[PDB]
Every structure is written in C-alpha cells, then in structure tokens.
Amino acid sequence: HMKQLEDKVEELLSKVYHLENEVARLKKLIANKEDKADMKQLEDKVEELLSKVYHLENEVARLKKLVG
Amino acid sequence: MKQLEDKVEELLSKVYHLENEVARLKKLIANKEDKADMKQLEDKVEELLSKVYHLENEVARLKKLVGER
Amino acid sequence: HMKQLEDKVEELLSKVYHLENEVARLKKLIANKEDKADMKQLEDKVEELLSKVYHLENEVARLKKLVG
C-alpha cells in the first residue's frame, strides 16, 4: 500500500513536470500575440484615414463637375 | 497514513483540473492575433497615411486652380 | 519509508502551488491579448482603404491633366 501510494505521487510529479513544460511553451507563444492595449493607435489611424478618404472622395466628385 | 492518502487525493484533483485548464488555455492562445500579422497591417496603414497626405496636397492645389474654397 | 513518502507529498504540494499560480497568471495574460475574430472589421477597413486610395490616385492624375 505504501509503495502504491508512493508510485501515485511519482506519477503526479511527472504529470506536474509535463504541465510545467507545457506552461513554459505557452508563455513563449503568448509573448508573440498582440495585446489589446496596443490596438488603439492603429484603430485611430484607420478611423482618421476613413474620414480623410471620405472627404477626398467628396472633393474629387466636386472637382470633376467643375472641370467637366 | 490516511491523512497522507487524503492529501494525495486532493492533489490528484488539483492536477486533473490543471490539465483541463492548460488544455483550454492552449486553445485560446491559438485564436489570438499574432504580432507578426499586426506588424504587416501597421505597414499597410503607414503606406496609406503617406498616400493620403499626398492626395490631400494635390487636391488642395486643384481646388486653388479652379477657384474652389 | 514514511519519511520519504511525506517528503515527496510535500514536494508535490509545493510544485502544484507553483503551477496553480502561474496558470492563474497566464489566464489573465491571455485575456489581455486580441482575438483574431475581433480583428475582422479593422482588416476589412484597411482593405477598403487600399482600394479607395488607388482609385483616388487615378482620379486625381486625370484631374491634374485636365486642369493643366
């Protein structure tokens, strides 16, 4: 019985060792993923571009009328 | 001895839970945006900023030439 | 025999505590990373901008010629 329990503890130690290795790998993977906190600057640039392009399109339509 | 047994029982439970949790986290990580992909998106946007700046300058000049406010 | 088993149970308790803490931390870190599914609207805007800007460039070239 004592042997059997010691064997179970050894098996669990081995499982925990494997999980530690897996967690180490996941830490590396997550470090190469984009943070939500870094999204906003890009989002703002895109929103500004959309506004600027809308204005340009409106101006170009007006110029086409006048030139033609 | 039974105390030791009960301790291993509770540790066993914790380990099974951690196995499940780590499996779930592995899946969540796979669904996240890569920094490398973000960088390429940022590069496109930087090019767009330059092109739009130029267009704005060209359109301002055209407006002047046709007498448009 | 008993002393050895206790030392391994103690070892396992400590390693599990360590693993639990780092998994809890990883969970929160992962939650702060951007999901690919939440990128699609931004990606579509950038694609739309590429097209709109290319079109504007062609229109503006044509206007510059016609205006003189």
Numbering used by the authors:
A (entry chain B), C (entry chain A): 0 to 67
B (entry chain C): 1 to 69
What does the published report state?
A9b in fact crystallized in two alternative structures, but in both the β-layer formed over the central glutamate. Since this residue was indeed too large and polar to be accommodated without distortion, the first turns of the downstream helices are perturbed to different extents in both instances, leading to a pronounced kink in one of the structures (highlighted in pink in Figure 3A). We were surprised to see that the penalty introduced by the central glutamate was not sufficient to produce the alternative structure; the reasons for this are unclear to us at present.
The structure of coiled coils is understood at a level unrivaled by any other fold. They consist of at least two α-helices, wound into superhelical bundles and held together by a mostly hydrophobic core. We find that they indeed break the α-helices to form short β-strands, which associate into a triangular supersecondary structure we name the β-layer.
